[PDB]
Amino acid sequence: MIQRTPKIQVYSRFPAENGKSNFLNCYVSGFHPSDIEVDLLKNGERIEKVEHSDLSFSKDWSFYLLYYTEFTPTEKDEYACRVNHVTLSQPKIVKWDRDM
Ligand SMILES: [Cu+2]
């Protein structure tokens, strides 16, 4: 019964070491999940082997949700989460910043 753009936070499971394998995470929360579409991107390109958790929600249908994939970072490679949702007129993109 309330409306809001979905919050998106992008972080790595362990602290990042170039060349060392790790996991990339995108935590999405908001209202009215409603077929929301989430992708992870390596240099603007959609990744294939992406897992997600069950979607958690409460009465008013606020929700959170996690998408992730194993990956192994470098300085050259650009990583990001991309979300598609009714409240968005276009796909929203948050970049993974290992210092932020
Ligand atoms: Cu609502």
Name the residue ranges covered by the structural domains of the chain. Answer: 1-100
Give me ligand 1 centre to Cα 15, in Å. 35
Backbone angles phi, psi at 80, to 5 degrees: -160, 160
Cβ atoms 38, 82 nearer than 8 A: yes
Contacts of 12 (CB under 8 A, 6+ apart): 22, 23, 24, 25, 73, 96, 98
Task: From the options 3.30.365.10, 2.60.40.10, 3.40.50.300, 3.70.10.10, give the CATH code of 1-100.
Answer: 2.60.40.10
Resolution in A: 2.7
* Tokens representing residue 61 in the block: 């249908």
Q: How was this structure determined?
A: X-ray
Strand order in the sheet with 79-84: 45-46, 37-42, 79-84, 92-95
Give me ligand 1 centre to Cα 72, in Å. 38
- Count of CB atoms within 10 A of residue 89's CB? 6
